[PDB]
PDB file of all heavy atoms in Angstrom:
ATOM      1  N   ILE M   1      91.985 101.261 108.313  1.00  0.00           N
ATOM      2  CA  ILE M   1      91.344 102.487 107.861  1.00  0.00           C
ATOM      3  C   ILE M   1      92.341 103.538 107.401  1.00  0.00           C
ATOM      4  O   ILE M   1      91.956 104.442 106.648  1.00  0.00           O
ATOM      5  CB  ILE M   1      90.418 103.082 108.945  1.00  0.00           C
ATOM      6  CG1 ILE M   1      91.224 103.600 110.129  1.00  0.00           C
ATOM      7  CG2 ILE M   1      89.414 102.069 109.409  1.00  0.00           C
ATOM      8  CD1 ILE M   1      90.380 104.211 111.215  1.00  0.00           C
ATOM      9  N   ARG M   2      93.602 103.471 107.814  1.00  0.00           N
ATOM     10  CA  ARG M   2      94.643 104.369 107.339  1.00  0.00           C
ATOM     11  C   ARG M   2      95.881 103.557 107.012  1.00  0.00           C
ATOM     12  O   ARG M   2      96.167 102.565 107.681  1.00  0.00           O
ATOM     13  CB  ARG M   2      94.995 105.432 108.377  1.00  0.00           C
ATOM     14  CG  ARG M   2      93.895 106.409 108.603  1.00  0.00           C
ATOM     15  CD  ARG M   2      94.245 107.461 109.630  1.00  0.00           C
ATOM     16  NE  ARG M   2      93.102 108.337 109.834  1.00  0.00           N
ATOM     17  CZ  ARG M   2      93.021 109.253 110.781  1.00  0.00           C
ATOM     18  NH1 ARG M   2      94.011 109.395 111.641  1.00  0.00           N
ATOM     19  NH2 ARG M   2      91.934 110.001 110.893  1.00  0.00           N
ATOM     20  N   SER M   3      96.600 103.967 105.982  1.00  0.00           N
ATOM     21  CA  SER M   3      97.887 103.383 105.639  1.00  0.00           C
ATOM     22  C   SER M   3      98.970 104.422 105.873  1.00  0.00           C
ATOM     23  O   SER M   3      98.756 105.612 105.636  1.00  0.00           O
ATOM     24  CB  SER M   3      97.917 102.904 104.190  1.00  0.00           C
ATOM     25  OG  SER M   3      97.017 101.832 103.982  1.00  0.00           O
ATOM     26  N   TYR M   4     100.121 103.972 106.347  1.00  0.00           N
ATOM     27  CA  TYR M   4     101.210 104.867 106.697  1.00  0.00           C
ATOM     28  C   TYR M   4     102.485 104.431 106.002  1.00  0.00           C
ATOM     29  O   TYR M   4     103.517 104.290 106.653  1.00  0.00           O
ATOM     30  CB  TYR M   4     101.445 104.866 108.201  1.00  0.00           C
ATOM     31  CG  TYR M   4     100.380 105.527 109.025  1.00  0.00           C
ATOM     32  CD1 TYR M   4      99.251 104.838 109.407  1.00  0.00           C
ATOM     33  CD2 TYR M   4     100.538 106.817 109.478  1.00  0.00           C
ATOM     34  CE1 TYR M   4      98.294 105.431 110.169  1.00  0.00           C
ATOM     35  CE2 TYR M   4      99.588 107.414 110.243  1.00  0.00           C
ATOM     36  CZ  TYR M   4      98.466 106.719 110.589  1.00  0.00           C
ATOM     37  OH  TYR M   4      97.498 107.314 111.367  1.00  0.00           O
ATOM     38  N   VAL M   5     102.438 104.181 104.703  1.00  0.00           N
ATOM     39  CA  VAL M   5     103.588 103.572 104.048  1.00  0.00           C
ATOM     40  C   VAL M   5     104.786 104.515 104.025  1.00  0.00           C
ATOM     41  O   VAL M   5     104.844 105.468 103.247  1.00  0.00           O
ATOM     42  CB  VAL M   5     103.204 103.072 102.644  1.00  0.00           C
ATOM     43  CG1 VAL M   5     102.619 104.177 101.812  1.00  0.00           C
ATOM     44  CG2 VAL M   5     104.419 102.512 101.954  1.00  0.00           C
ATOM     45  N   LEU M   6     105.771 104.230 104.874  1.00  0.00           N
ATOM     46  CA  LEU M   6     106.885 105.136 105.110  1.00  0.00           C
ATOM     47  C   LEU M   6     108.022 104.937 104.137  1.00  0.00           C
ATOM     48  O   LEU M   6     109.033 105.631 104.247  1.00  0.00           O
ATOM     49  CB  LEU M   6     107.432 104.977 106.528  1.00  0.00           C
ATOM     50  CG  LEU M   6     106.504 105.195 107.712  1.00  0.00           C
ATOM     51  CD1 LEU M   6     107.327 105.278 108.971  1.00  0.00           C
ATOM     52  CD2 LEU M   6     105.679 106.435 107.528  1.00  0.00           C
ATOM     53  N   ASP M   7     107.899 103.997 103.208  1.00  0.00           N
ATOM     54  CA  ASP M   7     108.967 103.787 102.240  1.00  0.00           C
ATOM     55  C   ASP M   7     109.015 104.927 101.239  1.00  0.00           C
ATOM     56  O   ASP M   7     110.002 105.664 101.167  1.00  0.00           O
ATOM     57  CB  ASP M   7     108.778 102.453 101.525  1.00  0.00           C
ATOM     58  CG  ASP M   7     109.042 101.280 102.425  1.00  0.00           C
ATOM     59  OD1 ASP M   7     109.800 101.440 103.400  1.00  0.00           O
ATOM     60  OD2 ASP M   7     108.507 100.193 102.143  1.00  0.00           O
ATOM     61  N   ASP M   8     107.950 105.105 100.471  1.00  0.00           N
ATOM     62  CA  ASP M   8     107.862 106.219  99.545  1.00  0.00           C
ATOM     63  C   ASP M   8     107.254 107.448 100.198  1.00  0.00           C
ATOM     64  O   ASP M   8     106.967 108.429  99.508  1.00  0.00           O
ATOM     65  CB  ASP M   8     107.062 105.815  98.311  1.00  0.00           C
ATOM     66  CG  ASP M   8     105.740 105.195  98.670  1.00  0.00           C
ATOM     67  OD1 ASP M   8     105.448 105.119  99.879  1.00  0.00           O
ATOM     68  OD2 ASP M   8     105.009 104.765  97.756  1.00  0.00           O
ATOM     69  N   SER M   9     107.046 107.404 101.511  1.00  0.00           N
ATOM     70  CA  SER M   9     106.619 108.546 102.309  1.00  0.00           C
ATOM     71  C   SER M   9     105.240 109.035 101.864  1.00  0.00           C
ATOM     72  O   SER M   9     105.031 110.182 101.484  1.00  0.00           O
ATOM     73  CB  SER M   9     107.678 109.651 102.250  1.00  0.00           C
ATOM     74  OG  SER M   9     107.782 110.204 100.952  1.00  0.00           O
ATOM     75  N   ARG M  10     104.296 108.114 101.936  1.00  0.00           N
ATOM     76  CA  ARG M  10     102.917 108.380 101.575  1.00  0.00           C
ATOM     77  C   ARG M  10     102.016 107.998 102.734  1.00  0.00           C
ATOM     78  O   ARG M  10     102.254 106.997 103.408  1.00  0.00           O
ATOM     79  CB  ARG M  10     102.523 107.606 100.325  1.00  0.00           C
ATOM     80  CG  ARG M  10     101.096 107.809  99.913  1.00  0.00           C
ATOM     81  CD  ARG M  10     100.846 107.247  98.534  1.00  0.00           C
ATOM     82  NE  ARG M  10     101.081 105.810  98.475  1.00  0.00           N
ATOM     83  CZ  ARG M  10     102.117 105.246  97.865  1.00  0.00           C
ATOM     84  NH1 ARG M  10     103.026 105.998  97.265  1.00  0.00           N
ATOM     85  NH2 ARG M  10     102.248 103.931  97.863  1.00  0.00           N
ATOM     86  N   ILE M  11     101.003 108.806 102.981  1.00  0.00           N
ATOM     87  CA  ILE M  11      99.967 108.480 103.942  1.00  0.00           C
ATOM     88  C   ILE M  11      98.632 108.611 103.243  1.00  0.00           C
ATOM     89  O   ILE M  11      98.406 109.564 102.494  1.00  0.00           O
ATOM     90  CB  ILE M  11     100.025 109.378 105.182  1.00  0.00           C
ATOM     91  CG1 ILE M  11     101.338 109.144 105.910  1.00  0.00           C
ATOM     92  CG2 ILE M  11      98.855 109.100 106.092  1.00  0.00           C
ATOM     93  CD1 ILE M  11     101.399 109.805 107.236  1.00  0.00           C
ATOM     94  N   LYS M  12      97.756 107.648 103.470  1.00  0.00           N
ATOM     95  CA  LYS M  12      96.486 107.568 102.764  1.00  0.00           C
ATOM     96  C   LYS M  12      95.411 107.128 103.741  1.00  0.00           C
ATOM     97  O   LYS M  12      95.436 105.992 104.218  1.00  0.00           O
ATOM     98  CB  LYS M  12      96.592 106.593 101.596  1.00  0.00           C
ATOM     99  CG  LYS M  12      95.275 106.212 100.961  1.00  0.00           C
ATOM    100  CD  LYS M  12      94.663 107.346 100.204  1.00  0.00           C
ATOM    101  CE  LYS M  12      93.511 106.849  99.358  1.00  0.00           C
ATOM    102  NZ  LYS M  12      94.001 105.964  98.265  1.00  0.00           N
ATOM    103  N   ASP M  13      94.477 108.017 104.043  1.00  0.00           N
ATOM    104  CA  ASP M  13      93.275 107.623 104.769  1.00  0.00           C
ATOM    105  C   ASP M  13      92.309 107.051 103.747  1.00  0.00           C
ATOM    106  O   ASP M  13      91.717 107.785 102.965  1.00  0.00           O
ATOM    107  CB  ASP M  13      92.665 108.803 105.512  1.00  0.00           C
ATOM    108  CG  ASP M  13      91.669 108.374 106.558  1.00  0.00           C
ATOM    109  OD1 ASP M  13      90.813 107.528 106.235  1.00  0.00           O
ATOM    110  OD2 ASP M  13      91.721 108.882 107.694  1.00  0.00           O
ATOM    111  N   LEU M  14      92.140 105.734 103.747  1.00  0.00           N
ATOM    112  CA  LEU M  14      91.398 105.091 102.672  1.00  0.00           C
ATOM    113  C   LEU M  14      89.901 105.153 102.920  1.00  0.00           C
ATOM    114  O   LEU M  14      89.126 104.393 102.333  1.00  0.00           O
ATOM    115  CB  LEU M  14      91.871 103.648 102.490  1.00  0.00           C
ATOM    116  CG  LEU M  14      91.833 102.638 103.632  1.00  0.00           C
ATOM    117  CD1 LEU M  14      90.474 101.990 103.783  1.00  0.00           C
ATOM    118  CD2 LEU M  14      92.880 101.586 103.337  1.00  0.00           C
ATOM    119  N   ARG M  15      89.486 106.071 103.777  1.00  0.00           N
ATOM    120  CA  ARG M  15      88.091 106.209 104.129  1.00  0.00           C
ATOM    121  C   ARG M  15      87.456 107.490 103.614  1.00  0.00           C
ATOM    122  O   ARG M  15      86.244 107.501 103.383  1.00  0.00           O
ATOM    123  CB  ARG M  15      87.937 106.132 105.655  1.00  0.00           C
ATOM    124  CG  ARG M  15      86.536 105.916 106.148  1.00  0.00           C
ATOM    125  CD  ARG M  15      86.547 105.673 107.637  1.00  0.00           C
ATOM    126  NE  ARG M  15      87.644 106.384 108.278  1.00  0.00           N
ATOM    127  CZ  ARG M  15      87.739 106.576 109.587  1.00  0.00           C
ATOM    128  NH1 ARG M  15      86.800 106.112 110.394  1.00  0.00           N
ATOM    129  NH2 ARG M  15      88.771 107.237 110.085  1.00  0.00           N
ATOM    130  N   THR M  16      88.237 108.549 103.378  1.00  0.00           N
ATOM    131  CA  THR M  16      87.688 109.869 103.087  1.00  0.00           C
ATOM    132  C   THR M  16      87.762 110.300 101.624  1.00  0.00           C
ATOM    133  O   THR M  16      86.746 110.764 101.104  1.00  0.00           O
ATOM    134  CB  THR M  16      88.330 110.923 104.002  1.00  0.00           C
ATOM    135  OG1 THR M  16      89.743 110.728 104.066  1.00  0.00           O
ATOM    136  CG2 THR M  16      87.771 110.816 105.393  1.00  0.00           C
ATOM    137  N   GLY M  17      88.887 110.193 100.909  1.00  0.00           N
ATOM    138  CA  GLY M  17      90.182 109.711 101.345  1.00  0.00           C
ATOM    139  C   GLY M  17      91.303 110.684 101.034  1.00  0.00           C
ATOM    140  O   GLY M  17      91.580 110.986  99.881  1.00  0.00           O
ATOM    141  N   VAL M  18      91.974 111.140 102.083  1.00  0.00           N
ATOM    142  CA  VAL M  18      92.916 112.250 102.023  1.00  0.00           C
ATOM    143  C   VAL M  18      94.331 111.701 101.939  1.00  0.00           C
ATOM    144  O   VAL M  18      94.731 110.879 102.769  1.00  0.00           O
ATOM    145  CB  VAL M  18      92.762 113.153 103.255  1.00  0.00           C
ATOM    146  CG1 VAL M  18      93.731 114.310 103.195  1.00  0.00           C
ATOM    147  CG2 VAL M  18      91.326 113.639 103.363  1.00  0.00           C
ATOM    148  N   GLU M  19      95.091 112.167 100.958  1.00  0.00           N
ATOM    149  CA  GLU M  19      96.494 111.809 100.820  1.00  0.00           C
ATOM    150  C   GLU M  19      97.371 112.780 101.596  1.00  0.00           C
ATOM    151  O   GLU M  19      96.915 113.813 102.087  1.00  0.00           O
ATOM    152  CB  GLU M  19      96.923 111.822  99.355  1.00  0.00           C
ATOM    153  CG  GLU M  19      95.932 111.195  98.408  1.00  0.00           C
ATOM    154  CD  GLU M  19      96.180 109.723  98.201  1.00  0.00           C
ATOM    155  OE1 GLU M  19      97.222 109.230  98.673  1.00  0.00           O
ATOM    156  OE2 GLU M  19      95.338 109.064  97.562  1.00  0.00           O
ATOM    157  N   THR M  20      98.648 112.430 101.697  1.00  0.00           N
ATOM    158  CA  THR M  20      99.657 113.295 102.290  1.00  0.00           C
ATOM    159  C   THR M  20     101.014 112.755 101.883  1.00  0.00           C
ATOM    160  O   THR M  20     101.202 111.539 101.832  1.00  0.00           O
ATOM    161  CB  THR M  20      99.561 113.337 103.816  1.00  0.00           C
ATOM    162  OG1 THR M  20      98.246 113.729 104.213  1.00  0.00           O
ATOM    163  CG2 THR M  20     100.567 114.332 104.378  1.00  0.00           C
ATOM    164  N   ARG M  21     101.951 113.647 101.592  1.00  0.00           N
ATOM    165  CA  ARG M  21     103.311 113.241 101.286  1.00  0.00           C
ATOM    166  C   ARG M  21     104.303 113.649 102.363  1.00  0.00           C
ATOM    167  O   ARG M  21     105.510 113.457 102.181  1.00  0.00           O
ATOM    168  CB  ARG M  21     103.735 113.812  99.941  1.00  0.00           C
ATOM    169  CG  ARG M  21     102.876 113.345  98.788  1.00  0.00           C
ATOM    170  CD  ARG M  21     102.733 111.838  98.788  1.00  0.00           C
ATOM    171  NE  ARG M  21     104.035 111.195  98.683  1.00  0.00           N
ATOM    172  CZ  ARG M  21     104.547 110.702  97.566  1.00  0.00           C
ATOM    173  NH1 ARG M  21     103.871 110.779  96.429  1.00  0.00           N
ATOM    174  NH2 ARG M  21     105.742 110.137  97.589  1.00  0.00           N
ATOM    175  N   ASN M  22     103.831 114.198 103.480  1.00  0.00           N
ATOM    176  CA  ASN M  22     104.692 114.662 104.564  1.00  0.00           C
ATOM    177  C   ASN M  22     104.426 113.795 105.785  1.00  0.00           C
ATOM    178  O   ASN M  22     103.641 114.149 106.666  1.00  0.00           O
ATOM    179  CB  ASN M  22     104.453 116.086 104.854  1.00  0.00           C
ATOM    180  CG  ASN M  22     105.524 116.677 105.738  1.00  0.00           C
ATOM    181  OD1 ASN M  22     106.514 116.017 106.051  1.00  0.00           O
ATOM    182  ND2 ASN M  22     105.322 117.916 106.170  1.00  0.00           N
ATOM    183  N   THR M  23     105.118 112.663 105.848  1.00  0.00           N
ATOM    184  CA  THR M  23     104.837 111.673 106.878  1.00  0.00           C
ATOM    185  C   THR M  23     105.358 112.112 108.238  1.00  0.00           C
ATOM    186  O   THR M  23     104.678 111.941 109.254  1.00  0.00           O
ATOM    187  CB  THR M  23     105.460 110.346 106.473  1.00  0.00           C
ATOM    188  OG1 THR M  23     106.857 110.546 106.227  1.00  0.00           O
ATOM    189  CG2 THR M  23     104.824 109.864 105.208  1.00  0.00           C
ATOM    190  N   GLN M  24     106.562 112.680 108.274  1.00  0.00           N
ATOM    191  CA  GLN M  24     107.177 113.034 109.546  1.00  0.00           C
ATOM    192  C   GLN M  24     106.313 114.008 110.324  1.00  0.00           C
ATOM    193  O   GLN M  24     106.175 113.889 111.545  1.00  0.00           O
ATOM    194  CB  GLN M  24     108.562 113.630 109.304  1.00  0.00           C
ATOM    195  CG  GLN M  24     109.392 113.771 110.551  1.00  0.00           C
ATOM    196  CD  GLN M  24     109.528 112.472 111.303  1.00  0.00           C
ATOM    197  OE1 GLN M  24     110.372 111.641 110.979  1.00  0.00           O
ATOM    198  NE2 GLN M  24     108.705 112.293 112.328  1.00  0.00           N
TER     199      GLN M  24
END
């Protein structure tokens, strides 16, 4: 339900779906 791809520092809730570029 959520992806936390820390390589390019992207977080994606694939349910709503809200992005974020601030992983830390």
Side-chain angles (χ1 to χ4, degrees):
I1 68 179
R2 292 180 182 171
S3 294
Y4 289 84
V5 56
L6 302 192
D7 289 335
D8 51 2
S9 67
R10 179 169 62 252
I11 296 189
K12 168 70 168 293
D13 196 313
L14 57 84
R15 195 172 31 166
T16 45
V18 180
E19 317 269 351
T20 304
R21 299 310 301 260
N22 193 6
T23 55
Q24 192 55 83

